[PDB]
CSV table of C-alpha atoms in Angstrom, one decimal:
chain,number,residue,atom,x,y,z
D,1128,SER,CA,0.1,2.2,-123.6
D,1129,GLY,CA,-2.1,0.6,-126.2
D,1130,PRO,CA,-1.6,1.1,-129.8
D,1131,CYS,CA,-0.1,4.1,-131.6
D,1132,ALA,CA,-1.7,5.1,-134.7
D,1133,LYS,CA,1.8,6.3,-136.8
D,1134,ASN,CA,3.5,3.5,-135.7
D,1135,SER,CA,0.8,1.2,-136.6
D,1136,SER,CA,0.6,-0.2,-140.2
D,1137,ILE,CA,-0.7,-2.7,-142.7
D,1138,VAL,CA,0.7,-5.9,-143.5
D,1139,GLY,CA,2.2,-5.9,-146.9
D,1140,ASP,CA,0.9,-4.3,-150.3
D,1141,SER,CA,-2.1,-7.4,-150.8
D,1142,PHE,CA,-4.5,-5.0,-149.4
D,1143,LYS,CA,-4.4,-3.4,-152.9
D,1144,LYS,CA,-5.9,-5.6,-155.1
D,1145,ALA,CA,-9.0,-7.9,-154.5
D,1146,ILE,CA,-11.5,-10.0,-156.1
D,1147,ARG,CA,-15.0,-9.3,-156.7
D,1148,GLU,CA,-17.4,-11.5,-154.2
D,1149,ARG,CA,-14.9,-13.2,-152.5
D,1150,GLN,CA,-14.5,-12.6,-148.7
D,1151,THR,CA,-11.5,-10.5,-148.3
D,1152,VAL,CA,-8.7,-10.2,-145.3
D,1153,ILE,CA,-6.2,-7.6,-144.2
D,1154,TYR,CA,-3.5,-8.0,-141.6
D,1155,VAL,CA,-2.6,-4.6,-139.3
D,1156,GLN,CA,0.2,-4.3,-137.2
D,1157,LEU,CA,-0.7,-2.7,-133.8
D,1158,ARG,CA,2.6,-1.4,-132.3
D,1159,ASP,CA,2.5,1.2,-129.3
D,1160,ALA,CA,4.6,4.6,-129.0
D,1161,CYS,CA,7.9,3.0,-128.6
D,1162,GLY,CA,7.4,0.5,-131.8
D,1163,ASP,CA,6.8,-2.7,-129.3
D,1164,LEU,CA,4.4,-4.9,-131.1
D,1165,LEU,CA,0.8,-5.0,-128.6
D,1166,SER,CA,0.8,-8.0,-126.1
D,1167,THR,CA,-9.4,-3.3,-129.5
D,1168,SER,CA,-12.1,-0.6,-128.4
D,1169,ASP,CA,-9.2,1.8,-129.5
D,1170,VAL,CA,-9.2,0.9,-133.1
D,1171,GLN,CA,-11.9,1.4,-135.8
D,1172,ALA,CA,-11.7,0.4,-139.7
D,1173,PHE,CA,-14.2,1.0,-142.4
D,1174,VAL,CA,-14.4,0.1,-145.6
D,1175,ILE,CA,-16.6,2.3,-148.5
D,1176,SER,CA,-17.6,1.1,-151.9
D,1177,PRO,CA,-17.3,2.7,-154.8
D,1178,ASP,CA,-21.0,3.7,-155.2
D,1179,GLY,CA,-20.2,5.5,-151.3
D,1180,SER,CA,-21.8,2.6,-149.2
D,1181,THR,CA,-20.3,1.4,-146.2
D,1182,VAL,CA,-19.5,-2.0,-146.0
D,1183,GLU,CA,-19.5,-4.2,-143.0
D,1184,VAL,CA,-15.5,-4.8,-141.5
D,1185,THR,CA,-14.9,-7.4,-139.1
D,1186,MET,CA,-12.1,-7.2,-136.8
D,1187,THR,CA,-10.9,-10.7,-135.2
D,1188,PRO,CA,-8.3,-10.1,-132.4
D,1189,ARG,CA,-5.4,-12.0,-132.8
D,1190,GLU,CA,-1.9,-12.7,-131.3
D,1191,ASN,CA,1.1,-10.2,-130.6
D,1192,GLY,CA,-1.3,-7.2,-131.7
D,1193,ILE,CA,-2.6,-8.5,-135.1
D,1194,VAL,CA,-5.6,-7.9,-135.7
D,1195,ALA,CA,-7.2,-9.3,-139.1
D,1196,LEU,CA,-9.6,-7.2,-141.1
D,1197,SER,CA,-12.3,-8.8,-143.1
D,1198,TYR,CA,-14.8,-7.8,-146.0
D,1199,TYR,CA,-17.0,-8.8,-148.8
D,1200,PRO,CA,-16.2,-6.4,-152.1
D,1201,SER,CA,-19.9,-7.1,-153.9
D,1202,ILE,CA,-19.1,-4.9,-156.7
D,1203,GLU,CA,-15.8,-4.0,-158.8
D,1204,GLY,CA,-14.0,-0.7,-158.7
D,1205,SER,CA,-12.3,1.7,-156.4
D,1206,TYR,CA,-12.6,1.3,-152.6
D,1207,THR,CA,-11.6,3.3,-149.9
D,1208,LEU,CA,-10.3,2.3,-146.6
D,1209,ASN,CA,-9.4,3.5,-143.7
D,1210,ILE,CA,-8.0,2.3,-140.2
D,1211,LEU,CA,-8.2,4.6,-136.9
D,1212,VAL,CA,-6.2,4.2,-133.9
D,1213,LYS,CA,-7.5,6.4,-131.0
D,1214,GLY,CA,-9.3,8.5,-133.2
D,1215,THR,CA,-6.1,8.7,-136.2
D,1216,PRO,CA,-5.6,7.2,-139.5
D,1217,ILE,CA,-2.9,4.4,-139.3
D,1218,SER,CA,0.0,4.8,-141.3
D,1219,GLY,CA,-0.6,4.7,-145.2
D,1220,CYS,CA,-4.7,5.6,-144.4
D,1221,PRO,CA,-6.9,6.4,-145.7
D,1222,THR,CA,-6.3,4.4,-148.9
D,1223,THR,CA,-7.5,3.0,-152.3
D,1224,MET,CA,-8.3,-0.8,-152.8
D,1225,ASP,CA,-8.8,-2.1,-156.3
D,1226,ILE,CA,-11.6,-4.8,-156.8
D,1227,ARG,CA,-11.6,-6.7,-160.1
D,1228,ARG,CA,-14.1,-9.2,-161.4
D,1229,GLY,CA,-11.2,-11.5,-162.2
């Protein structure tokens, strides 16, 4: 039946914090309407930097409905993340990610 936005979510809260100029990975668990894990044309993910620019997000399909989202935050500050399943934000989206120089 494909992924269900309300049942799909980001794995953990590690995504809330990241380091500038380091390739960063966020894991998303896709679940159908029944809550079952899948098993990706229905999934969209974008990241906006603190100056309003789009950041390229790479999505790699993994086993049993996990999708790895990778991005490279070039500047410090408050990034915006949104992940849409069939045009609907998943649970917990859109959200903030704080990138530090650390």
